[PDB]
């Protein structure tokens, strides 16, 4: 019914250049790979996330999937505990989510 | 949700 998630943002400014996009996507994809191979996601957020909750491991707590931005909710369809989703692009950059738990 | 990032 509800999911517990954490988030990481690899930032991009408005109207980013190709060089900026390629760098951010590369870093985001590498973080996804690390997270899918056992790296502590909260510590990856502490080290790399630009979002305001980075120091708290990007924790989002528990919630209902459809209340999140559609780009997140859609990507979380049928996701299982431990899944890493992303990179997901939006105007602010590349997003990565970890499904910490489900209940 | 306790926190929802901006997109």
Swiss-Prot record, chain A:
Gene Ontology, cellular component aspect: outer membrane-bounded periplasmic space
Q: Which domain of life is it from?
A: Bacteria
For the keyword Cell membrane, the answer is no
Q: Which residues form the PpiC domain?
A: 1-101
Instruction: Provide the protein's localization.
Output: Periplasm
Q: What is known of its domains?
A: The PPIase activity resides only in the second parvulin domain. The N-terminal region and the C-terminal tail are necessary and sufficient for the chaperone activity of SurA. The PPIase activity is dispensable for SurA function as a SurA protein with a deletion of the parvulin domains is almost completely functional in vivo. The N-terminal region and the C-terminal tail are also required for porin recognition.
Name listed for the protein in its UniProt record: Chaperone SurA
- Specify first residue, last residue and whole-protein length for the fragment: 172 to 274 of 428
């Amino acid at each position: 019914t509800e999911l517990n998630l954490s988030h990481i943002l690899i930032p991009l400014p408005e109207n980013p250049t190709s060089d900026q996009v390629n760098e951010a996507e590369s870093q985001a994809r590498a973080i996804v790979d690390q997270a899918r191979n056992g790296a502590d996601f909260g510590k990856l957020a502490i080290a790399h996330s630009a979002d305001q909750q980075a120091l708290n491991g990007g924790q989002m707590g528990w919630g209902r999937i459809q209340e999140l931005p559609g780009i997140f909710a859609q990507a979380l369809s049928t996701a299982k505990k431990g899944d890493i989703v992303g990179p997901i692009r939006s105007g602010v950059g590349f997003h990565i989510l970890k499904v910490n738990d489900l209940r | 949700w306790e926190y929802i990032p901006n997109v």
